[PDB]
Short mmCIF file of C-alpha atoms in Angstrom, two decimals:
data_model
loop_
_atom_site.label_atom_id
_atom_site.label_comp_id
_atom_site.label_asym_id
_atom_site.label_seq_id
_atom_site.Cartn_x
_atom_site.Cartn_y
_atom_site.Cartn_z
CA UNK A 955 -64.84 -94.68 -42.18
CA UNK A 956 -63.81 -91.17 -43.56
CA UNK A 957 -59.96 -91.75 -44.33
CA UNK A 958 -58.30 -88.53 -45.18
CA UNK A 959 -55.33 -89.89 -47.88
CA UNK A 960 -52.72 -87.66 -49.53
CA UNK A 961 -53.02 -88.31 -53.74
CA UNK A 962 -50.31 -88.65 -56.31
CA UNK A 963 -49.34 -90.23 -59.36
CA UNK A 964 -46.46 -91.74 -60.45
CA UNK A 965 -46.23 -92.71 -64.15
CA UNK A 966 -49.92 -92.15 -64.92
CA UNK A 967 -50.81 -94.74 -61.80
CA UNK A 968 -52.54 -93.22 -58.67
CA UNK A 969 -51.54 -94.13 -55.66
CA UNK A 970 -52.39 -92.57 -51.47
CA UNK A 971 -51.60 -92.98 -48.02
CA UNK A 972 -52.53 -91.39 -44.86
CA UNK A 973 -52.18 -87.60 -43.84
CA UNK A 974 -51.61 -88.61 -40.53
CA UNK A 975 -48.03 -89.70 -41.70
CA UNK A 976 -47.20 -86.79 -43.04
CA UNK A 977 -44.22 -84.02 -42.40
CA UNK A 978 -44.19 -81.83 -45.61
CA UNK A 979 -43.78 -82.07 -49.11
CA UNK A 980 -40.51 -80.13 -50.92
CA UNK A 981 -39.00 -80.38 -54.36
CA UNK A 982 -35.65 -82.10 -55.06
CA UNK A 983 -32.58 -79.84 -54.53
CA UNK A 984 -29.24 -81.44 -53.95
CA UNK A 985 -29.87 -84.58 -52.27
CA UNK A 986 -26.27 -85.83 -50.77
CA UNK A 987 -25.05 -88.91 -52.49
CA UNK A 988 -24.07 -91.68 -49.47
CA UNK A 989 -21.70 -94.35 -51.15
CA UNK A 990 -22.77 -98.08 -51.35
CA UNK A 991 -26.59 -97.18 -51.47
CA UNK A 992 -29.48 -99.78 -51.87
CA UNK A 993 -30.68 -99.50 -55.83
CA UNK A 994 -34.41 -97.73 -53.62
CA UNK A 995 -32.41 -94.71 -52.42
CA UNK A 996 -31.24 -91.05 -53.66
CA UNK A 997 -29.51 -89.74 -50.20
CA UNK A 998 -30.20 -87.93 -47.53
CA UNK A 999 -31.64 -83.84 -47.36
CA UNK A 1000 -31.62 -81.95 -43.88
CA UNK A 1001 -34.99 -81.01 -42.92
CA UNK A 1002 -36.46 -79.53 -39.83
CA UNK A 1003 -33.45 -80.27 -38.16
CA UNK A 1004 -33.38 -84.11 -38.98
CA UNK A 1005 -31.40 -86.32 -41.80
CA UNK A 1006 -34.10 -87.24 -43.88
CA UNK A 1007 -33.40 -90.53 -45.87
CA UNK A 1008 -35.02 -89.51 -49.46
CA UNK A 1009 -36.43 -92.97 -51.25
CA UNK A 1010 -37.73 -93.76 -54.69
CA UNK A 1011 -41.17 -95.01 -54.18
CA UNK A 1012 -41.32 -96.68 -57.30
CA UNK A 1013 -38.22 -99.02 -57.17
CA UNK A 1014 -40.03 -100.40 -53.50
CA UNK A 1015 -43.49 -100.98 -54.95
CA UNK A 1016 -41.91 -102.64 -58.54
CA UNK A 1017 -43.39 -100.03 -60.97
CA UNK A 1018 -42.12 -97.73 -63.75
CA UNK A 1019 -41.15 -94.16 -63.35
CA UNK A 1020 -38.62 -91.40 -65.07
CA UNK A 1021 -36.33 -89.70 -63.00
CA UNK A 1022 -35.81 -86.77 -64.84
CA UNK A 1023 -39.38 -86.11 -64.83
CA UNK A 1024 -40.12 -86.66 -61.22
CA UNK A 1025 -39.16 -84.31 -59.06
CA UNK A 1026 -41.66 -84.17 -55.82
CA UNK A 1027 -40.46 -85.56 -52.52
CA UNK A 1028 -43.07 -86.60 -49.95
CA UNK A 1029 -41.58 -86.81 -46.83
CA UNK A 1030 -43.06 -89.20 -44.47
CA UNK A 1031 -44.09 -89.14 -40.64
CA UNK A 1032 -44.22 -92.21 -38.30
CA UNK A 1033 -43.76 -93.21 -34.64
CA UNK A 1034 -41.07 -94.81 -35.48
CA UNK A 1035 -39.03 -92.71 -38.36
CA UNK A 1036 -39.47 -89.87 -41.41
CA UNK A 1037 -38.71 -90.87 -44.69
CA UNK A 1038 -39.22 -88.68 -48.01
CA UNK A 1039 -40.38 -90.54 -51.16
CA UNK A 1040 -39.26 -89.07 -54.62
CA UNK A 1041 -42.24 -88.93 -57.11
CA UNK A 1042 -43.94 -87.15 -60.08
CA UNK A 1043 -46.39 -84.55 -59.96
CA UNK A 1044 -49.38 -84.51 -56.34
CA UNK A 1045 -52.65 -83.87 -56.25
CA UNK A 1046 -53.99 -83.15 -52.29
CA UNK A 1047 -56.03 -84.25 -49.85
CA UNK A 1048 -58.85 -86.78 -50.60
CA UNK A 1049 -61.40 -87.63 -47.94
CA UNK A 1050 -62.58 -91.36 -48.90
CA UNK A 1051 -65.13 -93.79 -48.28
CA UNK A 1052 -65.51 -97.35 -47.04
CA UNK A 1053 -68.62 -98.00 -49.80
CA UNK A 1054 -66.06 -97.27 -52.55
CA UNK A 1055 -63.53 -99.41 -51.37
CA UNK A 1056 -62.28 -102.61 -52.19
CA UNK A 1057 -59.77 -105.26 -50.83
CA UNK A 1058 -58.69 -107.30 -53.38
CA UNK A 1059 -54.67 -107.28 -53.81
CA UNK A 1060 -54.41 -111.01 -55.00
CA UNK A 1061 -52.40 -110.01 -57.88
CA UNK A 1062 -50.32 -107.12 -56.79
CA UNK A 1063 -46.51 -107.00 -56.08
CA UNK A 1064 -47.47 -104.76 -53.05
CA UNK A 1065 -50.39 -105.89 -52.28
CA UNK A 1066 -49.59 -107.45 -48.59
CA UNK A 1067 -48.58 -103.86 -48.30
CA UNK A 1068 -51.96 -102.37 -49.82
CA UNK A 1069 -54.55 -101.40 -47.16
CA UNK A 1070 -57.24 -101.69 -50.60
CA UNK A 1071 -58.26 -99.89 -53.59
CA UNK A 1072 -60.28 -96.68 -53.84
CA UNK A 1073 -63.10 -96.82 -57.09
CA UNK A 1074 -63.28 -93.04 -56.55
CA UNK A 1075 -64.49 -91.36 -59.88
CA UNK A 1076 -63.37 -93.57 -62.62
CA UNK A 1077 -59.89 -94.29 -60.88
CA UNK A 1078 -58.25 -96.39 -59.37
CA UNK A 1079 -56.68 -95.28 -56.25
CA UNK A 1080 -54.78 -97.82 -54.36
CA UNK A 1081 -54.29 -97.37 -50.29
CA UNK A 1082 -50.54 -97.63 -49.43
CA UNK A 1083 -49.88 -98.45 -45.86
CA UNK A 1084 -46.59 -96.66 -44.57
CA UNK A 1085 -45.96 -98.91 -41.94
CA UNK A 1086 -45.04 -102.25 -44.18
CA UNK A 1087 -43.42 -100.23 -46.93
CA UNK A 1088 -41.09 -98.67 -44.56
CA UNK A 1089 -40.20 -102.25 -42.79
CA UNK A 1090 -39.16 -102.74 -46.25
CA UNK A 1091 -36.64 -100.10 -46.68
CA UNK A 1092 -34.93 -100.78 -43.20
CA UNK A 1093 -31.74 -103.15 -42.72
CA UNK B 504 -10.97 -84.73 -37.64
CA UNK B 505 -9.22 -83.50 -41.13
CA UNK B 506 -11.83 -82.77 -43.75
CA UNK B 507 -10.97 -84.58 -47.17
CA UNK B 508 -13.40 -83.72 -50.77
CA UNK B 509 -13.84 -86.01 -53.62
CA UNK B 510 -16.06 -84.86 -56.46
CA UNK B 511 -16.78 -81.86 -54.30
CA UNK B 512 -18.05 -83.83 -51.48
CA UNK B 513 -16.81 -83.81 -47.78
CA UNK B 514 -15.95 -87.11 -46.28
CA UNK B 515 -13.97 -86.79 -42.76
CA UNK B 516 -10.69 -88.33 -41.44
CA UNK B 517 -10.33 -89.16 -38.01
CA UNK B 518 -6.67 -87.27 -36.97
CA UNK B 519 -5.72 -89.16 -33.73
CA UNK B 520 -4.91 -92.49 -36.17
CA UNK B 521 -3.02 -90.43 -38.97
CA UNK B 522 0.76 -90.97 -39.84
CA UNK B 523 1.30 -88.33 -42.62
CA UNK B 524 -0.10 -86.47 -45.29
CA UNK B 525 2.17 -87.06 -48.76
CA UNK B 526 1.46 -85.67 -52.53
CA UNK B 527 3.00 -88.35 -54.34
CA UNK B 528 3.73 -89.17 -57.70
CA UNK B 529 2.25 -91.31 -60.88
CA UNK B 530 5.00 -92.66 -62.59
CA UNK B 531 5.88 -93.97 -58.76
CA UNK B 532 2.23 -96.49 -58.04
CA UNK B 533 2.85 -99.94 -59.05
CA UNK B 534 0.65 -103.51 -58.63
CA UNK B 535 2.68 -106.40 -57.68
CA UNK B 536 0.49 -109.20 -57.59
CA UNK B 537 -2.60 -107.31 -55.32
CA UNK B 538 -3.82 -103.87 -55.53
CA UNK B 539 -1.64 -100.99 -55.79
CA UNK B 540 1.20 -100.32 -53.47
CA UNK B 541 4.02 -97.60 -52.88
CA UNK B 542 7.38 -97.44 -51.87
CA UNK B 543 7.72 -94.71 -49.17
CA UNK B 544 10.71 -94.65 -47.11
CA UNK B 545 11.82 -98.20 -48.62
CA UNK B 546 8.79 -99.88 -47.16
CA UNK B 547 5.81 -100.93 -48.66
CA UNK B 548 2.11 -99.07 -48.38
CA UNK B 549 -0.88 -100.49 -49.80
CA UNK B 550 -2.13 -97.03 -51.41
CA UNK B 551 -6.09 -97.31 -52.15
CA UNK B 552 -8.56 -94.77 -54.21
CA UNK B 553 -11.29 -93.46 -51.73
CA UNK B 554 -13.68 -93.12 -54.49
CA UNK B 555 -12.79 -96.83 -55.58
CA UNK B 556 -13.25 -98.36 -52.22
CA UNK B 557 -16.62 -96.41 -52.43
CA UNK B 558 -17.71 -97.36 -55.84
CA UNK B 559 -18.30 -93.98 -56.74
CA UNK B 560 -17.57 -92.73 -60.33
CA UNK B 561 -14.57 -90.25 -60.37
CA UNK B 562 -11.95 -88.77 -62.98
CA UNK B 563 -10.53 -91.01 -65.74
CA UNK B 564 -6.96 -89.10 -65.98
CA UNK B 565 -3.83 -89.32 -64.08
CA UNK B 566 -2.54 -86.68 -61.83
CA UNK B 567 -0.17 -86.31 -59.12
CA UNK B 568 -2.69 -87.45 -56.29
CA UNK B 569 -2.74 -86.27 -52.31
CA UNK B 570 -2.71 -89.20 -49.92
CA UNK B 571 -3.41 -89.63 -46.09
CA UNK B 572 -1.27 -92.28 -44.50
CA UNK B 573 -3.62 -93.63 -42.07
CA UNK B 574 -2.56 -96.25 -39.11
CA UNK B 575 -4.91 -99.55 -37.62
CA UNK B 576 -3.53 -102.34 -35.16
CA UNK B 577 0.48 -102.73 -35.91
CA UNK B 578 -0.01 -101.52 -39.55
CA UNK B 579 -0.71 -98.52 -42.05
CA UNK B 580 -2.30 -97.99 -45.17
CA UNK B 581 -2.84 -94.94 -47.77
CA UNK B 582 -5.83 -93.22 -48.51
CA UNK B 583 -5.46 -91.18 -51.82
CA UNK B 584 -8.43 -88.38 -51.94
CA UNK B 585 -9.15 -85.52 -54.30
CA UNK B 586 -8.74 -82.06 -52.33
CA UNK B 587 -8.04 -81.07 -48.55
CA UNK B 588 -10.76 -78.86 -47.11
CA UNK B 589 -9.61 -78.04 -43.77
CA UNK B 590 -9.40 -79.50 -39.48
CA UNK B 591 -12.68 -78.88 -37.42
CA UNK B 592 -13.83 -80.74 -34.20
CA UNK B 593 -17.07 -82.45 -35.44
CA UNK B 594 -20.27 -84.01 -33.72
CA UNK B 595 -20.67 -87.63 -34.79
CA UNK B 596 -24.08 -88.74 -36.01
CA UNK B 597 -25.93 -92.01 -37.09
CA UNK B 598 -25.08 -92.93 -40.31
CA UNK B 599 -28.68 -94.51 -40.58
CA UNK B 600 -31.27 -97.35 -40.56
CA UNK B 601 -31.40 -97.76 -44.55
CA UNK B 602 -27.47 -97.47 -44.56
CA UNK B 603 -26.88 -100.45 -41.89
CA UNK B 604 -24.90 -102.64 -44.35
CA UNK B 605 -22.03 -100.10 -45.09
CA UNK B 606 -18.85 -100.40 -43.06
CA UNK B 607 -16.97 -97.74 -44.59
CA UNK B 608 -18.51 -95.27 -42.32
CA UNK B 609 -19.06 -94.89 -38.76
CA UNK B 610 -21.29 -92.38 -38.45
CA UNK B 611 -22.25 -89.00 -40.83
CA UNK B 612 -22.16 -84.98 -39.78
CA UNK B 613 -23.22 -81.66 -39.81
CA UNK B 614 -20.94 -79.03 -40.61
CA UNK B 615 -20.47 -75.54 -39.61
CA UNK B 616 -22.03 -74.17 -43.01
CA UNK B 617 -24.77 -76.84 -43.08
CA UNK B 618 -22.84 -79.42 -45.37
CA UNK B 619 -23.21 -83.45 -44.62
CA UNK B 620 -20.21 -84.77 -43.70
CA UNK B 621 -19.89 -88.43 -43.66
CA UNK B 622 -16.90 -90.09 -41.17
CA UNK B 623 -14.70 -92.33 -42.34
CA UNK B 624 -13.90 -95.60 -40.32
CA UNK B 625 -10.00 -96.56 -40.21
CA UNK B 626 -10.28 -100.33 -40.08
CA UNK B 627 -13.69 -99.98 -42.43
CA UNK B 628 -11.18 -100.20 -45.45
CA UNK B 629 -9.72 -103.62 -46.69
CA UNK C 395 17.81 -44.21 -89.08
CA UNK C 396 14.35 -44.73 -88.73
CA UNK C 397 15.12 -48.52 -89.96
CA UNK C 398 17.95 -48.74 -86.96
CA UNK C 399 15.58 -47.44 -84.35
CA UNK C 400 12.86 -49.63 -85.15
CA UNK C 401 14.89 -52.50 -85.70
CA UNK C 402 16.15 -51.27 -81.99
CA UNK C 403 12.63 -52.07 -80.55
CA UNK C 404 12.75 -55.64 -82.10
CA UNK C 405 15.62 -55.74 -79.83
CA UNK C 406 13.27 -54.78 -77.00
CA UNK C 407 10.38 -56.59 -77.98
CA UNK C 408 13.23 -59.64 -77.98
CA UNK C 409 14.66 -59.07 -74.43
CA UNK C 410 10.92 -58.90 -73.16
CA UNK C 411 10.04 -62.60 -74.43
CA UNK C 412 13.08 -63.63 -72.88
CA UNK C 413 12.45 -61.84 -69.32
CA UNK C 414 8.47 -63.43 -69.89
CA UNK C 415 9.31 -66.94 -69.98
CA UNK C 416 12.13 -66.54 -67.11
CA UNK C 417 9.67 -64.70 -64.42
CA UNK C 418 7.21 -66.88 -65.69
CA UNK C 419 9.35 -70.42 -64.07
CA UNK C 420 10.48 -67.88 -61.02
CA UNK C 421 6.55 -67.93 -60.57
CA UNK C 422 5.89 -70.80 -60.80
CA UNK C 423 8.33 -72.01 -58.80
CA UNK C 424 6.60 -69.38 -56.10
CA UNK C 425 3.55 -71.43 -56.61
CA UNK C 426 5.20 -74.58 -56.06
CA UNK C 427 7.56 -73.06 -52.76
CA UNK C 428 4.10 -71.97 -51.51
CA UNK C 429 1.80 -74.96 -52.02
CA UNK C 430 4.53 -77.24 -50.56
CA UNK C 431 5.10 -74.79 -47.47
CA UNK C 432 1.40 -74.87 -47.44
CA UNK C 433 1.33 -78.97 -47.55
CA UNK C 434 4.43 -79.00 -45.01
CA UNK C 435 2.32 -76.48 -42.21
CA UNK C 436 -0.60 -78.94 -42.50
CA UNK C 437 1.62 -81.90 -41.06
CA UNK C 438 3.02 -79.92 -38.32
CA UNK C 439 -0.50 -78.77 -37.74
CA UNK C 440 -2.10 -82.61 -37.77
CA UNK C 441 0.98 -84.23 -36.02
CA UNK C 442 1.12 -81.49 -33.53
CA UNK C 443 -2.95 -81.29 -33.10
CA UNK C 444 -2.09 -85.44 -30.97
CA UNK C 445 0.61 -84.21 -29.37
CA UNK C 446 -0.67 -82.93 -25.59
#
């Protein structure tokens, strides 16, 4: 099926979900500190008339990251809540195909969270879904 | 509510629970055998740090500090905060589904200029 | 007489360091009347802001 996913890197790794769950995408300016945060969270930014809860991807999925260099916050859209994620540098929109995907996750420390890998030009692209990773996040 | 700022950030006090509002002194805060206390009136206030009971990092140097007296069940204890912005009638919001765990707060809030507010709970603080 | 008269504005120059340093704590003691009035009006105002 042609999947429409929203591409971005963080530390040199590439990573996508959906464009159906998305709101926007904004840079990082003063993001309000809430006392007695989770070690995953920033703060929270107003946006669009909602308090946004800004996460750091990253420190969910169990990868490495700088946070001095990233600086890109994609905020998040589902049924059930919006939720920005704080990462590096985005690419855009990628229309993918099932003949270039595959669904091994067997050893990855998301990968019950992984809807599969994308072979797409010499990369690998793995397939976030939002769902899971924001059941995470939640207490 | 009486809007309170530590390190430049507003965190709301609920006025109807209040007792008084006291600048008080450093050479006067001594420890007994528990955490800090003052003698006010001859009687005996367990003064805390906001930015303590928050875990929040926060000047080093010692200064004559302005506390809120604030009162729960029978009892009363001090809340010692930074700088005093000033009254409003606020609308209380969630403080949110990631934040579930922290009982300092009862809910956050937007101000009148667009600042976050969060609100502070009275018997949140032990 | 030109070493009497400006010896006289060391005299001056003398009575205005004094004056400095004595409107100086009248000053500050303005600062700290105000600020306390200021502190004081803010309890009336939160203990009468309960009060029906």
């Amino acid at each position: 099926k042609e999947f429409e996913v929203l591409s971005f890197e963080i530390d040199e790794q590439a990573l996508a979900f959906d464009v159906d769950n998305i709101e926007m995408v904004i840079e990082k300016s003063d993001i309000t500190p809430v006392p007695k945060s989770r070690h995953f969270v920033e703060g929270v930014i107003n946006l669009r008339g909602r308090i946004i809860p800004v996460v750091n991807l990253a420190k969910i999925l169990g990868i490495s990251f700088d946070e001095q260099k990233m600086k890109s916050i994609i905020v998040a859209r589902t049924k059930d809540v919006e939720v920005g994620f704080l990462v590096d540098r985005v690419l855009g929109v990628l229309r993918i195909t099932e003949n270039q995907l595959d669904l091994t996750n067997v050893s990855d420390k998301f990968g019950k969270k992984s809807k599969g890998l994308v072979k797409t030009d010499g990369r690998l692209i793995i397939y976030l879904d939002i769902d899971k990773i924001i059941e995470e996040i939640t207490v | 509510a009486l809007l309170v700022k530590v390190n430049n950030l507003v965190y709301a006090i609920p006025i109807a629970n209040i007792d008084t509002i006291l600048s008080i002194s450093k050479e006067d805060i001594q420890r007994v055998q528990d955490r800090d206390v003052i003698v006010i009136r001859g009687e005996v206030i367990p003064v805390y740090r906001l930015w303590e009971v928050l875990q929040i990092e926060h000047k080093e140097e010692l200064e004559e500090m302005e506390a809120v007296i604030v009162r729960v069940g029978n009892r009363k204890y001090g809340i010692v905060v930074d700088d005093l912005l000033g009254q409003d009638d606020i609308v209380i919001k969630s403080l949110g589904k990631v934040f579930s765990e922290v009982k300092e707060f009862s809910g956050a809030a937007i101000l009148g200029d667009g600042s976050i507010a969060l609100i502070i709970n009275v018997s949140g603080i032990v | 007489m030109i070493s009497n008269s400006a010896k006289d504005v060391e005299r001056v120059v003398e009575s205005f360091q004094k004056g400095a340093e004595e409107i100086t704590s009248f000053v500050e003691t303005i600062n700290a009347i105000a600020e306390q009035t200021n502190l004081l009006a803010l309890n009336a105002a939160i203990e009468a802001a309960r009060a029906g």
